[PDB]
Amino acid sequence: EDIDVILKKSTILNLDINNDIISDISGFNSSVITYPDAQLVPGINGKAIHLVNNESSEVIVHKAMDIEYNDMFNNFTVSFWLRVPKVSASHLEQYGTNEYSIISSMKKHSLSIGSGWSVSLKGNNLIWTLKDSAGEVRQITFRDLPDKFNAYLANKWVFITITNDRLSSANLYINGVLMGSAEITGLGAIREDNNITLKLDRCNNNNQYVSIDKFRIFCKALNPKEIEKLYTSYLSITFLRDFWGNPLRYDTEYYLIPVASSSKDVQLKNITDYMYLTNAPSYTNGKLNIYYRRLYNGLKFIIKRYTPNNEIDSFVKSGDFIKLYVSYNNNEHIVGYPKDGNAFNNLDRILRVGYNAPGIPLYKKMEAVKLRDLKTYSVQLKLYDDKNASLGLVGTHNGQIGNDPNRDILIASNWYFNHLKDKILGCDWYFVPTDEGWTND
């Protein structure tokens, strides 16, 4: 049949946030109970659930009568976006073996045996657990990547999907890709609690927290294709996103990192002058098998709205016109290109920060857009002159300026418009805001 129709018809539970209220929009009307300390924060598409480590921070879904998907060997899929802060070297050492659940249908410490299923975390491992009425259990243990810059449990919003085929295996997907599997054949009937609990259970780290979004459940095992579509259907483009996957915002400091070479930071030659790439330093921990380029080094940029267009939205929308500034010494300096400004072969125009030569027009009208790579939280910036003609997308060009050493200098070029289909490009940028979910060790 039709994939979109299948995804829709197979849904028996779909949590959505509207008017700051959490509820089931699947159509089955399951009751949703939000506790006092269950917080709401920016999400992949609207707001998301944020859970802290105390008993007041939880969300309970009491299943409607008709919603029975874990019947006698009935296939089912659970999906939701997830965001877990990067685990510090210390905490990894201190709480590494502490496995705690965050989502579960298992009623614990009571009359029934270990009920249905659970999603738990243990160090840098994501775990899916299935337990039947007899107490038999099956598990999928996913070990995150060593390089936290590209890891799935390192402060970025990632899409999780776990499919369960009672005649074969349980499969764990992340951003639409298979990351783990486990045969579940031989398992008997699952008799879970009529309650689906979103809460940190048995977590020894008082500072631990997580964010969960679009929690959904299907009454069938979605296939790769259906999962791919589900995943991408959430990638709306109304708003642009920062490095963590949250809505891009105005009047906010962001470090820029070129997607094409995530190893570089941005530096400024001098006020009124040009910008260029630098080698960011890395953190490495052999015994913990964890490493990553450090963040928060290099220039700090701020996005300001070009003009107020009836309504002031704190979020930057794709297509919004803006003015880019860099914060240097408690002062904000406009980024742009002055008329007749030095440029590589008259095509790659070298950007200037705080250029102020009297009598010389300085072009600064930029447009923040999302022109490619919808799965990555990157952004493109387009520069225009006073005649609203395109001076090109922002990127870099290797060369020299006077006696300075060879560098990858920040430029604006229209040349990128003829390669918008490449895997990697050069005009793609990550906007990185300081975040408590990531601190360099």
Ligand SMILES: N[C@@H](Cc1ccc(O)cc1)C(=O)N[C@@H](CCC(=O)O)C(=O)N[C@@H](Cc1c[nH]c2ccccc12)C(=O)O
């Ligand atoms: N309008 C002309 C001439 C001009 C006079 C004075 C002034 O303050 C700026 C310009 C012009 O465009 N001159 C510029 C070209 C544009 C530009 O460089 O951004 C020019 O010739 N600049 C010199 C000086 C310069 C530029 N980038 C530098 C980086 C390090 C050190 C010196 C730099 C140039 O290099 O071309």
